[PDB]
Amino acid sequence: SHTVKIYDTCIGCTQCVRACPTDVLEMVPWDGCKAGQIASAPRTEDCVGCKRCETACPTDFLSVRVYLGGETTRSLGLAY
């Protein structure tokens, strides 16, 4: 399964979570930004690696980073 990391440059704009096609990211409470929220990656087993999450990231060099790793039938997007 791929690896997804969140960095404290998160501004809690939720654009990553609402762009994930496989429900990998979610918004959790935080105290490091104005919005009081930070993205989390608790379901990386469903991560497919499409990187839509970091295409919607407005922070300078990203706050969500997807590191491709071992492959799985879920991560390979295999309907068969």
Binding site: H2, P21, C47, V48, G49, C50, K51, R52, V66, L68, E71, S75, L76, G77, A79, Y80
Partner: protein, 739 residues
Amino acid sequence: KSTIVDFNPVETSFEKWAKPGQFSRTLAKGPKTTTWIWNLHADAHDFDIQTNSLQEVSRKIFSAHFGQLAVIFLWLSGMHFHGAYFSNYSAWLTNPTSTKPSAQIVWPIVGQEVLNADVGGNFQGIQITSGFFQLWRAEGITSEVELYWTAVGGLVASFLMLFAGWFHYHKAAPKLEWFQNVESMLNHHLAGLLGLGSLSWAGHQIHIALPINKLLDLGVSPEEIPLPYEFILNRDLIAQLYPSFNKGLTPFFTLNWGEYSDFLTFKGGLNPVTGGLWLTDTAHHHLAIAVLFIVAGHMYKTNWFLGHSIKTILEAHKGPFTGEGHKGLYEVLTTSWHAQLAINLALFGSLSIIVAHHMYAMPPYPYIAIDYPTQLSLFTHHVWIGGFCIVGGAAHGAIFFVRDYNAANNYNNLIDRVIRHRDAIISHLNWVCIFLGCHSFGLYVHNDTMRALGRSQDLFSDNAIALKPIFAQFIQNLHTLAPGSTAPNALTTVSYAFGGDVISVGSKIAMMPISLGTADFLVHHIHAFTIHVTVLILLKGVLYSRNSRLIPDKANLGFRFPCDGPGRGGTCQVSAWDHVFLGLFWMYNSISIVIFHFSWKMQSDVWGTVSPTGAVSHITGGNFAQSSITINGWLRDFLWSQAAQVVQSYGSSLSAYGLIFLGAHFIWAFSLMFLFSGRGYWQELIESIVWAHNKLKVAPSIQPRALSITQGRAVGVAHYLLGGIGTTWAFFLARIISV
């Protein structure tokens, strides 16, 4: 306040000319990177994203059609003007079989005047392979003054179409209901446009082209031929050549149409003097076409209680296997310009290819069959246009599926049922493509390896394991027996390609029976295989344009997007555009093979010279039958052998063909930089270049960015097509002009 048009919808102003990108909501803010410049031209004609109203898109399309027709009229006016002023048309008229048509002279600069060839008739210029001279002769044009007047009329018509486009966008723009009158539009395009154009052309042929060309074939010089208007004012100048005009129009109105058999014939074959189709046959053909199309125009209900409703016809064509059938197709084709473009472009390209075939098969112009460069150029050009238009039709079908397809409005109809079993279609088409490719190409490779191993009796040849195209030979036999048996009123077969006598004009073969052997079997199956693979790519693009097992929401990404990401193992080129890109490549492959087959087969087994005793000697000498069955044969006896004229053209009047050969090779190789590489490398190189510019304080405010992934693919495919087609263009033209 008319019910069909809106008056003064858009003000005629230059203000928006000074605001580039005003049409787009995203581009209107102004450029920030160089990507804006490329996006400006990529969205210029995408009227769907510029307005949210179908009416505005339709009006823009209508005015764009007017602009295109004005451009076409300007091009035709230029052609006629060049024929009038910079051509040897008058000299070619008096010696069609010994003077090469030329209509473009080259200025004497930088030594380029060598391009002015010895085309004959005390003229120097570039030999013309568009066949305008033969067309003008078939029109009865015997003077360059008539060409000048046709050019002036073309200029006037081009201005008229420009004014029409301006008028119908800015002064009186039609409403959506006017555009959606598909019944009225079909009625008019079938009766008025097609039928009345055929009728008017039949009238022109009968009254101008029939007498003038008959006098020309009789040996009368163009100077003593009467002016065309005299054939109308004087019923005695035409009644001598065709002694049926003496009865006037009485036989027509008295149903005694047999009297007009003098100039409305049904002969078939070719004119022995000119080598083209009998112009009496052509006039009769256009008359019959006019009547048929006028009749066909009275089919759809427009404004009276009479005719058909296309909605009622489609909705009644259901079936046990097709569910709701054609229900909803009328709404699809009356609310989506992209669906209409798909159908029209596909059928238009297919029509262009059919035209290309019927052109050389039955030469319709005087002294055009013996002008081998003209025949080769016309066939290749029309087949290329057909392939491009077919790929465009597939592209716009995919665009309709992505954008204008409504799932709710198409419940259980044909479109829905096709998407529901797209897997089966694509898998079976994949199997067919593999079967056809394996067989055709592996038979070619088996022939090559048997020849390389010294086993000549193990080939798929005529003197070996033979694959006779018996079905095509049966059809050829049926056509050569048609006159008198199935077409009892015919005097000769439609084309001598099916069989018959060798038709030669001035010791040059015009048409001759095209024998089909094992070599034609293999190349025909190659054609079928390439066409099937192109269809596979395009149909996979259209069907999987909305969703798939990989990307269940591919429609939300649009028609044109590079990917969905490196995930799922990699989701490159999943668009539907990336399928029109690969399909463009495969169309290039298929059309290149088709034109190669045509060129080699014609040069080897049709074209040539006929000795006075009747011995036929061809351009190459019949090497197609035995050497077109191996890839080494194609490489050596066709490519290497017929490329001799291109490479040895330096210093001669064909040197421009060698230069274009080299430049097209350069462009084709240039394409591979964009096709093989990726955007990240070029962006990171532009980073260092920008560092240098910033170090010298010369970094542009518009930030330079590497071409987008989709634009990189588009540039690659455009350069690839240009280079390959230009290389084949120069090769064909130099080879067929030299010999």
